[PDB]
Design a protein around this ligand. Structure first.
Ligand SMILES: CCCCCCCC/C=C/CCCCCCCC(=O)O[C@H](COC(=O)CCCCCCCCCCCCCCC)COP(=O)(O)OC[C@@H](O)CO
Ligand SMILES: CCCCCCCC/C=C/CCCCCCCC(=O)O[C@H](COC(=O)CCCCCCCCCCCCCCC)COP(=O)(O)OC[C@@H](O)CO
Lengths: 391, 391
């Protein structure tokens, strides 16, 4: 979103989007899924820690590396940059590792069904199963958990360094032009406080946002292949793709209509920060001179701070009305859609469980993003502050 | 935890704890649950929005008000304070509203079983149930959701004002003694940046922490009355209270052993903040004078900042190893405990579902607290900074 990284941001992102679309179209249905080496299609290793060593996953890794390599080799000659390696390859690696973690989560999800089957068989007929099978199954689960832990730790470490690299680039570029840039009010805050909060906020709210989109993309095909049993939606009528449209619309609206409703919030934190800077400057001048910490001026500055903060707190009531209601209704959205299908007698028990489980695991990814909306507000305010400062 | 609020913190908290214990003992089993007015015991209104109007809940509200009134009337004469009303009554009200929200959540939980029963009956025999019963049930759910929304909005608003009152008290008390307190390094940051972050962090991490303890206290009796079917724990032997000890130990260790493991983390953010202050001061001096923004000094300050931040990022690997592992194993802890009971053939199907559901809803409250551990680290660092500054 900046110019310190990202060699030419005007055309870099367009090229990234176009190339991503071309590659995805080629792989998914473009007939590019032909595997001449070894037939790993229509058959995969069962649930175990070796699931990530079969030739299918190796082929996917190779394809991803080839695509990223072509893109990077184009851009490294089209337009050189000092931070090119981080700005391109680190982003690619972060996206890849997030996808890998979603896959590991799906594997843990799949491991549950046979264990429940074994438990049910033990409860019904006990002379078939012993304790050894249980210990073996727990061993397999620990095998998956170890890989999850190992990848997650390094993911966090690399994300931290990448974000700090971004902060270094921003600070260097601002301080390069400090002479004609200090005349703006609150200049000292822009380059240090704002950059720190941007780094810390993006380290926390960036991974979560990519993870939700990845979860939706991962679970979409199951709803595509399962929406043949739901022909009607409650107050819509009859659409050809029942569950996919419902899920996409629900998630997109829950993320976007809240932003539209609370569009005025990020414009208040701005003013809040300004008044606080006007406060802090005085104290910094007062830490040496004894004549600059007089009571009345401190009184006036704190009075202004209070007056702005009260208005900010006031403008959260009509946002919380929407957010809390959306959270409350979301728990039964996946069961609301099935009223006409039950009375029509089309669906059966067990398929209801599949739909409900899928919708629940989809909701789990956006729950954390919605529950922490103050951080997004702070990030958006930081974006506006830096953008206004850049001109 | 301070002296600006809380008239005499040395003896106030001890009195609060003792009085809370006395009241709880009197009500729970002290025989104080006699209701001479109307017999609401051993019978309650079914699942509806009127559940919070029966004489049982009114009696509880009256008892709570009487206890808080006695305590406040004692302290308002024992030791006067300027902020007494906020410091006592606001805390009481916040705790009460959190309990109320947990109760509403329990009601929504209970509403599920009959709806599934109706759905199953519709699936088996369709000539009994029509669409009107479904619409009525959805109406009842909306009735509960409305109360949830209305209470939550005002809860957030009041918490915001109470926290800002705390910040006002702290700032007034520090600025009262500014002359002999400015000689400490980084004084300007203590009174403005640290107070702001303390307010914003406590507004977010305070409610979540109280909510988890309230959830545990609410669900404890069910495990007390249900642990008669589990006589053995996996590698423990035979204890008289199976599930209660397991739940309490699991939650307490997951919250506390992580803190013990990462005890060294809060001591690093301190230094981080110091170096950043040493940076910002220079820029604030440079916003007017043109001879104080020389490149080399900025270089040295940023070099120090980078050197400290790298060490901080390094010390998260061995903390994430524990945190991610704890999150990963927690998903199957409630099913691990039941291996000996299944092979012993004591428990039956359906009771397993109850145990698993209870443990899942207990885990849901601590999941949000564990997933956001950076905020707790920041809060603890703020506490240490202010405590060191106060002496
Ligand atoms: C202003 C607009 C800005 C837009 C910015 C964003 C632009 C767009 C983002 C793209 C990143 C994500 C790419 C992948 C998206 C799709 C996600 C995904 O999982 O796709 C897989 C296929 O992917 C594929 O073949 C696709 C391969 C794509 C390879 C990479 C190409 C783009 C490189 C970009 C470099 C960084 C650029 C700068 C970013 C900021 C599906 O596999 P599938 O389930 O069948 O299982 C196969 C096997 O493992 C057996 O299960
Ligand atoms: C250094 C140490 C510091 C320690 C600081 C903390 C000190 C301790 C905290 C206490 C707050 C919470 C009190 C309540 C704790 C127990 C929580 C609770 O829900 O207790 C209920 C009974 O409570 C009761 O009778 C108890 C009534 C207690 C009334 C209030 C007394 C204390 C007032 C304090 C004022 C603020 C002081 C300063 C705090 C910072 C159970 O009902 P029950 O499920 O049977 O359903 C009945 C009916 O509704 C039908 O279901």
């Amino acid at each position: 979103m900046f110019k310190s990284f990202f060699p030419k941001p005007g055309t870099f992102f367009l090229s990234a989007f176009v190339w991503a679309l071309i590659a995805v179209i080629f792989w998914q249905a473009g007939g590019g899924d032909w595997v001449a080496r070894i037939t790993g299609a229509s058959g995969q290793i069962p649930i175990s820690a070796a699931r990530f060593w079969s030739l299918d996953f190796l082929i996917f890794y190779a394809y991803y590396i080839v695509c990223v390599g072509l893109f990077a080799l184009f851009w490294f000659i089209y337009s050189p940059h000092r931070w090119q390696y981080w700005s391109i390859l680190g982003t690619a690696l972060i996206i890849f590792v997030t996808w890998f973690l979603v896959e590991v989560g799906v594997a843990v999800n799949a491991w549950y069904a046979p264990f429940y089957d074994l438990i049910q068989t033990a409860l019904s007929s006990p002379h078939k199963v012993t304790i050894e099978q249980f210990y073996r199954e727990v061993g397999v689960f620990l095998g998956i958990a170890l890989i999850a832990v190992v990848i997650s730790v390094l993911n966090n470490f690399f994300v931290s360094h990448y974000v700090f690299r971004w902060r270094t680039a921003m600070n260097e570029y601002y301080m390069a032009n400090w002479q004609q840039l200090r005349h703006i009010e609150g200049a000292a805050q822009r380059v240090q406080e704002d950059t720190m909060r941007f780094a810390s906020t993006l380290e926390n709210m960036g991974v979560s946002f990519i993870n939700a989109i990845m979860t939706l993309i991962a679970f979409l095909p199951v709803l595509v292949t399962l929406s043949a049993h739901v022909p009607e939606l409650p107050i819509i009528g009859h659409i050809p793709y029942g569950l996919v449209i419902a899920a996409i619309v629900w998630s997109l609206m829950g993320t976007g209509l809240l932003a539209v409703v609370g569009i005025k919030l990020p414009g208040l934190e701005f003013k809040n920060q300004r008044v606080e800077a006007a406060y802090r400057k005085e104290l910094v001048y007062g830490e040496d001179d004894a004549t600059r910490a007089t009571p009345p001026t401190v009184r006036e500055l704190f009075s202004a701070v209070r007056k702005n903060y009260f208005r900010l707190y006031f403008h959260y009531m009509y946002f919380n009305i929407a957010r809390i209601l959306y959270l409350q209704v979301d728990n039964v959205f996946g069961l609301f859609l099935l009223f006409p299908s039950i009375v029509a007698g089309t669906i059966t028990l067990g398929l209801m469980t599949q739909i409900t489980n899928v919708f629940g695991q989809v909701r789990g990814a956006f729950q954390y993003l919605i529950n922490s909306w103050t951080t997004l507000v702070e990030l958006m305010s930081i974006y506006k502050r830096l953008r206004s400062f850049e001109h």
